Motif scaffolding. Structure first.
Motif, PDB file in Angstrom:
ATOM      1  N   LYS A   1      42.242  19.311  33.392  1.00  0.00           N
ATOM      2  CA  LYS A   1      43.446  19.878  32.805  1.00  0.00           C
ATOM      3  C   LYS A   1      43.481  21.403  32.838  1.00  0.00           C
ATOM      4  O   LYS A   1      44.568  21.984  32.926  1.00  0.00           O
ATOM      5  CB  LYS A   1      43.602  19.320  31.401  1.00  0.00           C
ATOM      6  CG  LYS A   1      42.387  19.494  30.559  1.00  0.00           C
ATOM      7  CD  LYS A   1      42.568  18.756  29.260  1.00  0.00           C
ATOM      8  CE  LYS A   1      42.526  17.258  29.503  1.00  0.00           C
ATOM      9  NZ  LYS A   1      41.189  16.816  29.979  1.00  0.00           N
ATOM     10  N   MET A   2      42.338  22.082  32.818  1.00  0.00           N
ATOM     11  CA  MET A   2      42.371  23.516  33.079  1.00  0.00           C
ATOM     12  C   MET A   2      42.930  23.796  34.462  1.00  0.00           C
ATOM     13  O   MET A   2      43.769  24.685  34.636  1.00  0.00           O
ATOM     14  CB  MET A   2      40.980  24.122  32.945  1.00  0.00           C
ATOM     15  CG  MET A   2      40.728  24.789  31.631  1.00  0.00           C
ATOM     16  SD  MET A   2      39.043  25.363  31.477  1.00  0.00           S
ATOM     17  CE  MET A   2      39.047  26.649  32.693  1.00  0.00           C
TER      18      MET A   2
ATOM     19  N   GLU B   1      46.621  23.296  34.599  1.00  0.00           N
ATOM     20  CA  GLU B   1      47.423  24.341  33.990  1.00  0.00           C
ATOM     21  C   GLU B   1      47.413  25.640  34.772  1.00  0.00           C
ATOM     22  O   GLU B   1      48.412  26.360  34.757  1.00  0.00           O
ATOM     23  CB  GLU B   1      46.950  24.615  32.568  1.00  0.00           C
ATOM     24  CG  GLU B   1      47.854  25.500  31.732  1.00  0.00           C
ATOM     25  CD  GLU B   1      49.330  25.153  31.788  1.00  0.00           C
ATOM     26  OE1 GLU B   1      49.711  24.097  32.327  1.00  0.00           O
ATOM     27  OE2 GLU B   1      50.135  25.960  31.277  1.00  0.00           O
ATOM     28  N   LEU B   2      46.314  25.980  35.439  1.00  0.00           N
ATOM     29  CA  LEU B   2      46.296  27.233  36.186  1.00  0.00           C
ATOM     30  C   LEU B   2      47.139  27.137  37.453  1.00  0.00           C
ATOM     31  O   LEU B   2      47.930  28.035  37.750  1.00  0.00           O
ATOM     32  CB  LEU B   2      44.865  27.628  36.528  1.00  0.00           C
ATOM     33  CG  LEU B   2      43.920  27.933  35.383  1.00  0.00           C
ATOM     34  CD1 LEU B   2      42.524  27.778  35.873  1.00  0.00           C
ATOM     35  CD2 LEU B   2      44.131  29.309  34.892  1.00  0.00           C
TER      36      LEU B   2
ATOM     37  N   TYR C   1      47.390  33.738  34.294  1.00  0.00           N
ATOM     38  CA  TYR C   1      46.686  32.933  35.291  1.00  0.00           C
ATOM     39  C   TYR C   1      45.183  32.987  35.033  1.00  0.00           C
ATOM     40  O   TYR C   1      44.408  33.417  35.877  1.00  0.00           O
ATOM     41  CB  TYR C   1      46.998  33.410  36.709  1.00  0.00           C
ATOM     42  CG  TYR C   1      48.374  33.087  37.207  1.00  0.00           C
ATOM     43  CD1 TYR C   1      48.938  31.848  37.018  1.00  0.00           C
ATOM     44  CD2 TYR C   1      49.137  34.056  37.827  1.00  0.00           C
ATOM     45  CE1 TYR C   1      50.210  31.578  37.471  1.00  0.00           C
ATOM     46  CE2 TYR C   1      50.403  33.799  38.269  1.00  0.00           C
ATOM     47  CZ  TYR C   1      50.936  32.565  38.091  1.00  0.00           C
ATOM     48  OH  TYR C   1      52.203  32.323  38.544  1.00  0.00           O
ATOM     49  N   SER C   2      44.776  32.552  33.846  1.00  0.00           N
ATOM     50  CA  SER C   2      43.385  32.704  33.449  1.00  0.00           C
ATOM     51  C   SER C   2      43.051  31.704  32.358  1.00  0.00           C
ATOM     52  O   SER C   2      43.931  31.069  31.785  1.00  0.00           O
ATOM     53  CB  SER C   2      43.118  34.109  32.952  1.00  0.00           C
ATOM     54  OG  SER C   2      43.762  34.288  31.717  1.00  0.00           O
ATOM     55  N   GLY C   3      41.759  31.580  32.071  1.00  0.00           N
ATOM     56  CA  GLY C   3      41.324  30.715  30.984  1.00  0.00           C
ATOM     57  C   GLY C   3      39.869  30.958  30.659  1.00  0.00           C
ATOM     58  O   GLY C   3      39.197  31.748  31.318  1.00  0.00           O
TER      59      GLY C   3
ATOM     60  N   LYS D   1      49.871  25.773  38.550  1.00  0.00           N
ATOM     61  CA  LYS D   1      51.109  25.022  38.386  1.00  0.00           C
ATOM     62  C   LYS D   1      52.130  25.279  39.500  1.00  0.00           C
ATOM     63  O   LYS D   1      52.581  24.318  40.145  1.00  0.00           O
ATOM     64  CB  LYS D   1      51.715  25.298  37.013  1.00  0.00           C
ATOM     65  CG  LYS D   1      52.670  24.228  36.556  1.00  0.00           C
ATOM     66  CD  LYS D   1      53.283  24.578  35.217  1.00  0.00           C
ATOM     67  CE  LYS D   1      52.333  24.320  34.071  1.00  0.00           C
ATOM     68  NZ  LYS D   1      52.144  22.869  33.836  1.00  0.00           N
ATOM     69  N   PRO D   2      52.534  26.523  39.772  1.00  0.00           N
ATOM     70  CA  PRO D   2      53.575  26.720  40.789  1.00  0.00           C
ATOM     71  C   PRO D   2      53.206  26.228  42.175  1.00  0.00           C
ATOM     72  O   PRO D   2      54.095  25.780  42.909  1.00  0.00           O
ATOM     73  CB  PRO D   2      53.807  28.232  40.760  1.00  0.00           C
ATOM     74  CG  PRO D   2      52.637  28.784  40.126  1.00  0.00           C
ATOM     75  CD  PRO D   2      52.213  27.795  39.118  1.00  0.00           C
ATOM     76  N   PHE D   3      51.937  26.290  42.569  1.00  0.00           N
ATOM     77  CA  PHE D   3      51.550  25.696  43.843  1.00  0.00           C
ATOM     78  C   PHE D   3      51.910  24.216  43.871  1.00  0.00           C
ATOM     79  O   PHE D   3      52.391  23.698  44.889  1.00  0.00           O
ATOM     80  CB  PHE D   3      50.054  25.876  44.092  1.00  0.00           C
ATOM     81  CG  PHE D   3      49.575  27.302  44.037  1.00  0.00           C
ATOM     82  CD1 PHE D   3      49.415  27.955  42.840  1.00  0.00           C
ATOM     83  CD2 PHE D   3      49.249  27.973  45.185  1.00  0.00           C
ATOM     84  CE1 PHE D   3      48.969  29.244  42.798  1.00  0.00           C
ATOM     85  CE2 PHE D   3      48.802  29.261  45.136  1.00  0.00           C
ATOM     86  CZ  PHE D   3      48.665  29.892  43.943  1.00  0.00           C
TER      87      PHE D   3
END
Ligand SMILES: [Mg+2]
Lengths: 1340, 586, 49
Positions: free
Chosen positions: B126-127, B130-131, B104-106, B133-135
């Motif tokens: 897009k960052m 991607e972070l 859960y990082s970038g 996603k499940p929400f």
RNA sequence: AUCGGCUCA
DNA sequence: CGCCGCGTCTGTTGAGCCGATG
DNA sequence: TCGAACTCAGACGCGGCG
């Protein structure tokens, strides 16, 4: 003016005449290797030294021997381009000549038994391509010079290692090229000490006894004594007048018949004067003078043999009676005084436990090799083969020179091995330097550091291989048969090949070559490192090495070095530097004779430079005579000052031999700071070659040399006139004068279209000449990746106008316009490489096929029959490139499913798939597919197609070559036939083949028809055999690593362009990171409509003092005005005379420039094409330290009707109002850099996990998560947050049940957390309790 | 066990295994062979040697290079025992147990955006897709657009506009943590609140670059998200960006306005002697704005206006007083953002950056926190806007050489020639000549510098309503150096006057000093002498950081434990404090 | 990941950490010097029990 | 997975 | 008590890339 | 089992010898 000079002449502002022109930029590799492999007849350089140093080998018993003779190199199987496509080394075989002669054991010298003579193959050695780079397994590779400490002697002084004492301690060192060191040292109380190879300290003089020579002889060699006589009554001492000097008297000094000096009275100069005027040497003295002295020569009882006193030992007064009575009428003693002659040797003696040679050798022998018994042979062998064997100790040719020079001998050369006299002399000069005479050496002097390059390193490695073989030769020669033993059997070529191929591709110094530019090559090849085998390390080196020394002036660049951990350890060679014959560095100078600066040039080393006095290039030479002003600036003994007009000796050559070639390409270097110039010269090497390259409007005159000598542009080989120009080859026809009479004289250049550069960028070449125009030798015919008409053009030049703008350029940021992205003047190409291999598993072989189990029909549209992508199909991350299936276990079955699987009909061996696929996030357009196959595998259809194609082109090229050859030859064979009459109407009426059948006359023409037939026959035979050779080389099968069947290889090609976040930088060291891309309207527009293209920040000049860019901007705006004026004259279609007049007015503008171009000579079309080439802006030049000045630049600005001050009125884009104050506007020249954004951004939510410790992987290549190092943990504890790092320690990293249930809760809408134990902790528990320690955690 | 020491396959039938398997095989073989020789009662020496070799195998397994020389592998590199899978910078305790990897990082490259408010930052689309996603999966399934998880996977990947609507819903009110390594002190990671943009770079506020120590020339920055419900409240109430504005080393504010906003604030509030609208009267700040904007008056031209200022000297409530003040037009434009509690003499001056910092500090003292945040942000906006609107460039005409520079150097050279003459006649010693020469060169340096600065600062001579007056200048170098944006007096001296004496690597001072500056260009060996000091500075900067970091680690590791536990210890007397002005003045 | 094994040595051996670490924790207990304990365990001499 | 080499702030 | 000599143990943090070997 | 390794350096505690 050559033919690429009349195209576009660049204007010079230089003012000093030039005497020497820059040499071939990269001579050091070429010369080093070229003298490694050449066949020296007599003066051993290269391989012949390596052989003749293992000059013939005899047996253990001495019953035969084989004798080396000569050597030769074959020719390589493949030329470079094939050797780089194929994927194999580029090498040559080594063939040696050998003779084995057998001499009988019966006769003393019965040599006439057998003489076997032949050739022996051993090893293969790589060669140097034309430019200076090796190819090793297909990747071009470069090896870097090294700079190490010269072998020889060495004095210095530590500043009291036991610093509590506070007293300096001197020491001396001997270091040879191959062998064991030797150190001499003092101690805090003045006792000499030795040590070998940093073993335990031993008291000195133990070597002195170890030479098997005792107190008497050697320590008579050491002191020269003081003479006395016992004249049967008393003591007389002989007094040399120059002995009592700076001394004090204890009693009334007198003579035999006079009184000279009173008691309590120092011996002044007059006293010696009186004594020498009296010519008296023998003086009676009280015998108490001997109370305190020491004996010099051993005296015994001549009757019994009892040593009265061993040499160099104490004495007494009863011993005076003993000496007088034994028959000794003389006494030798020591002239001792710690300030002049201290008893350092004396104390060293009376601390040594030793008396004879045997004890010393035994002690040393059990010191270095403790335990093993010290037999006499063992001790003697250890002390001989340590320092006195040519096999295990050799100084050098250079070490001997340095040794003999540092001790003030006369003869330069001698033996390569130590001896007695040398150690004696080292000891004596060390004590001498202790007493106050002479002084220590220093290390950073460029007269004590030597450069060592390719030839020498390769020679040493190949010698190691040779000696390893010599071992087994001696082994095998002694035992077996001799008369039937051919020498070829008893060698092994493995060790030589192993050693050489290990060094050329595994060492510390073989490196890839950074192929970003031309700069990147010819700076990565002229580099001088200090690390590696036999050098420093990044942590050992202190602060003394990393610093600039006064001896670097003209040998090594001072403003060129990396910035990381290794600042001063690697640095680039200067422009004019040579290398001496021994290996020290050299620089040019001009001789001065009686005030006249002559023209002959002398090279000087690093030590002779200090004796003379040197002038400077800026000293205003007074028009052929002597210097103008009285106190000329000069430098000598490493300092600068003002001297006369006659004392000077040398004046250095050119105003720019102090800098390198990376940092002589930035204009106005003389105005901006030192470390900002470091950053500029250090990031000029990272640009990226764009689509269409563009010259620089302001350069430093040395563009053309770097672009040509870097060997990336195709230069003409011989003069001629162009025959055929195409986008991918040029065929040129030579002049008659340059054609030697064998061939027809056509040269053919095959340009290299789009190709990978091993930093993943694009290499391609473009033809630069039209059809039917002449070409002279040395021109350029095809620009390279980043050139433009033979000039290095490395980035693009844009209109910049800098002022602060709404904070979008806050700190170093840029603000590009949006017609810098429309015009495509910063896009680049990037190509990429993917591979797929098929092996032989235990079950069976892989396959490459299109029938992949369990894939939908959709993904298989883009594969042909053989299962490899089309050419031109454009792929995006996730697709299929090559279809591969891996067989697996075959389980056995029942008849019913046999019937079923025979009706439905699909398979025998249910089989995995492991095909190649584009890793996600990549896209592009395949452009080239290659297929490699063994020799024995059936060639699939597509490899057959590819090879047949390539054969078609090769045969076209060969027939075209031989056909234009025979176009000349058939002009010949048509002209020659015409003799013998005429058939003018029937000559060309009938087909040309029917020219051998017509009327024949006997007296000569039978020979004519016969030679027609003959030369036709040999021509056809050459053609057919040549083509057969080429076809055999193409269809030849390949060689692969064991277990591989065939490998395909697929390329891709993308196209990147500008967007926010992406870096740029100028030449002067002003980095930046684009911040916004702004519509056309908003850009500030000057009073005439044209907007700006960049908007820099003025708050970045005053604080870092890089005032270069302001003056560069002003010249940019000056040099574009003239381009605009020519454009106006030329669209409006004025005339030729006006263009001639104006352009000639532009080239005569400086104060006293040296370039004078007279174009009343140019013909009209040449002037017209020149004016065509300048319509984009007149280029200008400015050498580094002899630049242009403000008066000249303002005359330019006033020639084109522009404001002299340099700055204009800018309006605003959004509101239409005027900016309050004037603003600068000009033309900078700026570069891309390849720190793109598309290679940095990354983001992860869930992915892979490790194996042994169950926490996520790392790095973008394999889709990992970032790192939360302990520093962040301290940061997050200081705040007081405690739930957050519990979250970051268990449920996002290691706790397995925790992470699965956390994902469940998140997707379920409930935000909570059930933690456990980071399971790498219990990994730790098991690693500890595996040692035998009972770590285990109590319970509740 | 096995999985604690795997045996990983390769591409081509090769196996890569940890050294532990090798170290175990050696012991197994030695054990079996010694047992064999022990059964048959071999003669003594065989037993002795076999036992000693067993000893060596075991105590090389425990830790390799201790008893004798380390038993190397195939590659002339020592093996990896057990006892060095716990030590060093690579062991468990430091490489793998105190600092994890995290998902859960970038990370990406930073760049400026000045339209923000200081509790915000930018995220590329897009960052953030991607972070978080499940929400997104949860929201889609709850709305009823997707029945199952796979429907959600495909709807997210194909990127249909409803995904953008949902994503804009999720990130609202959800702070993220921004970090930049190295993290020297606790202000190194902060908690911002996202704003979605398109592009590839993490935008970031200008004022919070002094705390991170960030410049925008290629730095990089990392983003984490907080998952749970407690950690989200901690990222809101403890480590947000508007909650810590006083450094914990010493209570000095940490949002000083940096380098470009201060020049705008300094170009607004200054006075010219002639401009226009000289001496006419206004009725408030608003008519001053109208006049400056319509082009009837200049941005700085002295006037007298009517203003209304509020003091709250009473028992905690405000009272208003009005008057005619004597000020320019620029200051009367500023008075529109000062927040109703400050006296008017805060603005009547030419605002170098010390005055701006005092302005902010005084707002903090009187009115609390929230007005300080609002006010600091407004200062940033107006500084940028009125600094671009002037246009302030630097050109080769600005570096002004003093006129009296030939005379000074000529006199100094005459003096040194005389001292050299006296030495060559033997009157004076060795070192005395050296010392006197360096003194005279230093004096010449000082008076050249003073002449320069007497020519720059106050030389604009301009006339109005009479004869002549002199005022402080408008020379771009002088405004960038006076207000405090960039530079100082010493560095202007580098650019215009003599650039001093230079030192050689030993530490001594070389005799003949540099004489040219960066406008006239300098000679060859003058450059070759500047190089000495330049490289000494560069080499030192790169070899401090090692032992600096090491010292920080030892300190954090000693002071680790201590925490504030009890309320009042009840102890008696402590220590005594007195001033330390001693030696010299305060 | 959890189950362990064992080898049964034919003859006893000596743990390094409790011998070659600083003050030896064996030579301190028996009180005899270190060199003696190495030279016994290197198989060089005997010792009287 | 280890090792060597170049680079960024 | 007091030199004097010997073998351990330390030396910034995140990232990016490519050969080598098993 | 020969084959190197080198001049990191600064500090601390222990084993011998006076
Ligand atoms: Mg930075």
């Amino acid at each position: 003016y050559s033919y690429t000079e009349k195209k576009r002449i660049r204007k010079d502002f230089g003012k000093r005449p030039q005497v020497l022109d820059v040499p071939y930029l990269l001579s050091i590799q070429l010369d080093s290797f070229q003298k490694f492999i050449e066949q020296d007849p007599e003066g051993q350089y290269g391989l012949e030294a390596a052989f003749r140093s293992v000059f013939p080998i005899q047996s253990y018993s001495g019953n035969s021997e084989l004798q080396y003779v000569s050597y030769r190199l074959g020719e390589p199987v493949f030329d470079v381009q094939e050797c780089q496509i194929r994927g194999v080394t580029y090498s040559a075989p080594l063939r040696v000549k050998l003779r084995l002669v057998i001499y009988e054991r019966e006769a003393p010298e019965g040599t006439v038994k057998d003489i076997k003579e032949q050739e022996v193959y051993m090893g293969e050695i790589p060669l140097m391509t034309d430019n200076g780079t090796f190819v090793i397994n297909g990747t071009e590779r470069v090896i870097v010079s090294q700079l190490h400490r010269s072998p020889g002697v060495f004095f210095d002084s530590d500043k009291g290692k036991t610093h509590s004492s506070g007293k300096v301690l001197y020491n001396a060192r001997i270091i040879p090229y191959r062998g064991s060191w030797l150190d001499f040292e003092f101690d805090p109380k003045d006792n000499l000490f030795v040590r070998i190879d940093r073993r335990r300290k031993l008291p000195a003089t133990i070597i002195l006894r170890a030479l098997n020579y005792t107190t008497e002889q050697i320590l008579d060699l050491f002191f020269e004594k003081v003479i006395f006589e016992i004249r049967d009554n008393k003591l007389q001492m002989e007094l040399v007048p120059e002995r009592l000097r700076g001394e004090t008297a204890s009693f009334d000094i007198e003579a035999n018949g006079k009184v000279y000096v009173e008691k309590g009275r120092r011996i002044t100069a007059r006293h010696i004067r009186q004594l020498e005027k009296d010519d008296v040497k023998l003086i009676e003295v009280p015998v108490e003078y001997i109370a305190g002295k020491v004996v010099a020569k051993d005296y015994i009882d001549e009757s019994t043999g009892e040593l009265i006193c061993a040499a160099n030992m104490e004495l007494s007064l009863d011993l005076l009676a003993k000496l007088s009575q034994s028959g000794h009428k003389r006494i030798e003693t020591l002239f001792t005084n710690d300030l002049d002659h201290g008893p350092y040797i004396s104390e060293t003696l009376r601390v040594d436990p030793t008396n004879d040679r045997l004890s010393a050798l035994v002690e040393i022998y059990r010191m270095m090799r403790p335990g093993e018994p010290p037999t006499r042979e063992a001790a003697e062998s250890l002390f001989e083969n340590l320092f006195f064997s040519e096999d295990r100790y050799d100084l050098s040719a250079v070490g001997r020179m340095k040794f003999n020079r540092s001790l003030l001998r006369e003869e330069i050369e001698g033996s390569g091995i130590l001896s007695k006299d040398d150690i004696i002399d080292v000891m004596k000069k060390l004590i001498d330097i202790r007493n106050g005479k002479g002084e220590v050496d220093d290390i950073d002097h460029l007269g004590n550091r030597r450069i060592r390059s390719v030839g020498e390193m390769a020679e040493n490695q190949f010698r190691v291989g040779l000696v390893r073989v010599e071992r087994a030769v001696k082994e095998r020669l002694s035992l077996g048969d001799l008369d039937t033993l051919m020498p070829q059997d008893m060698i092994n070529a493995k060790p030589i090949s192993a050693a050489v191929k290990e060094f050329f591709g595994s060492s510390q110094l073989s490196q890839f070559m950074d192929q970003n530019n031309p700069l990147s090559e010819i700076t990565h090849k002229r580099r001088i490192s200090a690390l590696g085998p036999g050098g420093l390390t990044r942590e050992r080196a202190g602060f003394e090495v990393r610093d600039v020394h006064p001896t670097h002036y003209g040998r090594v660049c001072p403003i060129e070095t990396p910035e990381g951990p290794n600042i001063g350890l690697i640095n680039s060679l200067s422009v004019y530097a040579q290398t001496n014959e021994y290996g020290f560095l050299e620089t040019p100078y001009r001789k001065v004779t009686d005030g006249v600066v002559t023209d002959e040039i002398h090279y000087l080393s690093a030590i002779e430079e200090g004796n003379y006095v040197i002038a400077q290039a800026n000293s205003n030479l007074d028009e052929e005579g002597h210097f103008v002003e009285d106190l000329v600036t000069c430098r000598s003994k490493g300092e600068s000052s003002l001297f006369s007009r006659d004392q000077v000796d040398y004046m250095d050559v050119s105003t720019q031999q102090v800098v390198s070639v990376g940092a002589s390409l930035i204009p106005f270097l003389e105005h901006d700071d030192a470390n900002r110039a470091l950053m500029g010269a250090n990031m000029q090497r990272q640009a990226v070659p764009t689509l269409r390259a563009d010259k620089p409007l302001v350069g430093t005159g040395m563009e053309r040399a770097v672009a040509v000598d870097s060997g990336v542009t195709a230069v003409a080989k011989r003069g001629g006139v162009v025959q055929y120009v195409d986008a991918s080859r040029i065929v040129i026809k030579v002049n008659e004068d340059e054609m030697y009479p064998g061939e027809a004289g056509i040269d053919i250049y095959n340009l290299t279209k789009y190709t990978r550069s091993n930093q993943n960028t694009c290499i391609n070449q473009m033809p630069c000449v039209s059809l039917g125009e002449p070409v002279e030798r040395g021109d350029v015919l095809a620009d390279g990746p980043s050139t433009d008409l033979g000039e290095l053009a490395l980035g693009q030049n844009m209109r910049v106008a800098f002022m602060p703008w709404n904070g979008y350029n806050f700190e170093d940021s840029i603000l590009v316009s949006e017609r810098v992205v429309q015009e495509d003047r910063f896009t680049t190409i990037h190509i990429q490489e993917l591979a797929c291999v098929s092996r032989d598993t235990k079950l069976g072989p892989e396959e490459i096929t299109a029938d992949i189990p369990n894939v939908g029909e959709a993904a298989l549209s883009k594969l042909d029959e053989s299962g490899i992508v089309y050419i031109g199909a454009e792929v995006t991350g996730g697709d299929i490139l090559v279809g591969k299936v891996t067989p697996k276990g075959e389980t056995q079955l029942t008849p019913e499913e046999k019937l079923l699987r025979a009706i439905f009909g699909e398979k025998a061996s249910d089989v995995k798939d492991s095909s190649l696929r584009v890793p996600n996030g990549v896209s592009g357009t395949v452009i080239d597919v290659q297929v490699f196959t063994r020799d024995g595998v059936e060639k699939d259809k597509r490899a057959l197609e590819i090879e047949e194609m390539q054969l078609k082109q090769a045969k076209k090229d060969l027939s075209e070559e031989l056909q234009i050859l025979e176009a000349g030859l058939f002009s010949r064979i048509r002209a020659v036939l015409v003799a013998g009459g005429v058939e003018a109407e029937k000559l060309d009426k009938l087909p040309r083949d029917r020219w051998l059948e017509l009327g024949l006359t006997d007296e000569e023409k039978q020979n004519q028809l016969e030679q027609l037939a003959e030369q036709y026959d040999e021509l056809k035979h050459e053609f057919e055999k040549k083509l057969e050779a080429k076809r055999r080389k193409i269809t030849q099968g390949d060689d692969l690593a064991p277990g591989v069947l065939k490998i395909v290889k697929v390329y891709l090609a993308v196209k990147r362009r500008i967007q926010p976040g992406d870096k740029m930088a100028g030449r002067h060291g002003n980095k930046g990171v684009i911040s916004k891309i702004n519509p056309i309207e908003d850009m500030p527009y000057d009073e005439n409509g044209t907007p700006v293209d960049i908007v820099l920040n003025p708050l970045g000049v005053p604080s870092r003092m890089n005032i270069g860019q302001i003056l560069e901007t002003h010249l940019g705006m000056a040099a574009k005005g003239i381009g605009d004026k020519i454009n106006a004259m030329l669209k409006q279609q004025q005339e030729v005379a006006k263009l001639r007049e104006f352009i000639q007015r532009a080239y005569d503008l400086g104060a006293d420039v040296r370039q004078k171009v007279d174009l009343s000579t140019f013909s009209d079309e040449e002037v017209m094409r020149l004016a065509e080439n300048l319509r984009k802006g007149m280029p200008i030049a400015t050498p580094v330290f002899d630049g242009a000045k403000e008066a000249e630049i303002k005359e330019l600005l006033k020639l084109g009707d522009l404001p002299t001050s340099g700055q204009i009125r800018l309006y605003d884009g959004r509101t239409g109002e005027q900016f309050e104050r004037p603003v600068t506007v000009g033309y900078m020249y700026m570069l891309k850099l390849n720190h793109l954004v598309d290679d940095k951004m990354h983001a992860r939510s869930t992915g892979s996990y490790s194996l042994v410790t169950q926490q996520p992987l790392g790095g973008k290549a394999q889709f990992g998560g970032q790192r939360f190092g302990e520093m962040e943990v301290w940061a997050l504890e200081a705040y007081g947050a405690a739930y957050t790092l519990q979250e970051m320690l268990t449920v996002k990293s290691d706790d397995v049940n925790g992470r699965t249930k956390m994902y469940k809760n998140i997707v379920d809408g409930n935000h909570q957390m059930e933690p456990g134990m980071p399971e790498s902790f219990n990994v730790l528990l098991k690693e500890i309790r595996s040692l035998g320690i009972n770590i285990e955690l109590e319970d509740e | 066990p096995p999985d604690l020491r795997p045996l990983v396959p390769l591409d081509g039938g090769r196996f890569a295994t940890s050294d532990l398997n090798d170290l175990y095989r050696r012991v197994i073989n030695r054990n079996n062979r010694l047992k064999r020789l022990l059964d048959l009662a071999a003669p003594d020496i065989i037993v002795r040697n076999e036992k000693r070799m067993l000893q060596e195998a075991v105590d090389a397994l425990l830790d390799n290079g201790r008893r004798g020389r380390a038993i190397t592998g195939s590659n002339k590199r020592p093996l990896k025992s057990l006892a060095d899978m716990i030590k060093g910078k690579q062991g468990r305790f430091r490489q793998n147990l105190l600092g994890k990897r995290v998902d859960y990082s970038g990370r990406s490259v930073i760049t400026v955006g000045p339209y923000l408010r200081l509790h915000q930052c930018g995220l590329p689309k897009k960052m953030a897709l991607e972070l978080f996603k499940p929400f997104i999966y949860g929201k889609l399934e709850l709305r009823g657009l997707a029945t199952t998880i796979k429907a959600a996977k495909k709807m997210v990947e194909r990127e249909e506009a409803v995904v953008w609507d949902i994503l804009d819903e999720v990130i609202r009110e959800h702070p993220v943590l921004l970090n930049r390594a190295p993290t020297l002190h606790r202000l190194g990671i902060q908690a911002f609140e996202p704003v979605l943009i398109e592009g590839k770079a993490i935008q970031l506020h200008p004022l919070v670059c002094a705390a991170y120590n960030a410049d925008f020339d290629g730095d990089q920055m990392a983003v984490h998200v907080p998952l749970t419900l407690e950690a989200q409240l901690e990222a809101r109430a403890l480590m947000m960006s508007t909650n810590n504005i006083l450094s914990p080393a010493n209570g000095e504010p940490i949002i000083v306005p940096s380098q470009d906003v201060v020049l705008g604030l300094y170009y607004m509030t200054r006075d010219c002697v002639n401009a226009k609208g000289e001496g006419m009267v206004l009725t408030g700040p608003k008519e001053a704005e109208r006049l400056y904007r319509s082009g009837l008056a200049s941005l700085h031209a002295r006037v007298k206006v009517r203003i209304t200022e509020y003091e709250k000297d009473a028992n905690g409530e405000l009272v208003a007083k009005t008057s005619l003040k004597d000020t320019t037009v620029g200051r009367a434009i500023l008075w529109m953002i000062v927040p109703k509690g400050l006296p008017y003499s805060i603005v009547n001056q030419a605002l170098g950056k010390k005055a701006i910092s005092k302005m902010l500090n005084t707002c903090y003292r009187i009115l609390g926190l929230k007005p300080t945040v609002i006010f600091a942000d407004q200062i940033m906006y107006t500084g940028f806007a009125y600094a671009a609107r002037s246009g302030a460039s630097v050109g080769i005409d600005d570096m002004v050489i003093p006129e009296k520079k030939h005379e000074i150097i000529s006199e100094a050279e005459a003096e040194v020639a005389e001292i050299q003459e006296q030495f060559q006649s033997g009157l004076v010693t060795a070192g005395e000549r050296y010392n006197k020469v360096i003194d005279i060169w230093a004096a010449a340096n000082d008076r050249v510098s003073k002449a320069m600065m007497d020519n720059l600062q106050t030389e604009t001579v301009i006339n109005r309503d009479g004869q002549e007056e002199k005022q402080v200048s408008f020379n771009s170098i002088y405004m960038m150096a006076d207000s405090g944006a960039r530079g100082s007096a010493a560095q202007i001296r580098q650019l215009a006057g003599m650039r001093g004496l230079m030192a050689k690597p030993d530490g001594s001072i070389i005799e003949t000093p540099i004489t040219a500056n960066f406008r006239e260009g300098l000679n060859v060996l003058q450059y070759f002498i500047s190089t000495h000091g330049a490289r000494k500075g560069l080499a030192d900067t790169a070899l401090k950081t090692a032992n600096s970091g090491y010292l920080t680690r030892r300190l954090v590791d000693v002071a680790q434990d201590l925490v504030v536990t009890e309320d009042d210890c009840g102890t008696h007397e402590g220590i005594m404090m007195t001033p330390v002005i001693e030696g010299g003045d305060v | 990941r959890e189950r362990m094994g064992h080898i049964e040595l034919a003859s006893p051996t000596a743990h390094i950490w409790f011998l070659k670490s600083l003050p030896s924790r064996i030579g301190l207990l028996l009180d005899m010097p270190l060199r003696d304990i190495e030279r016994v365990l290197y198989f060089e001499s005997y010792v009287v029990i």
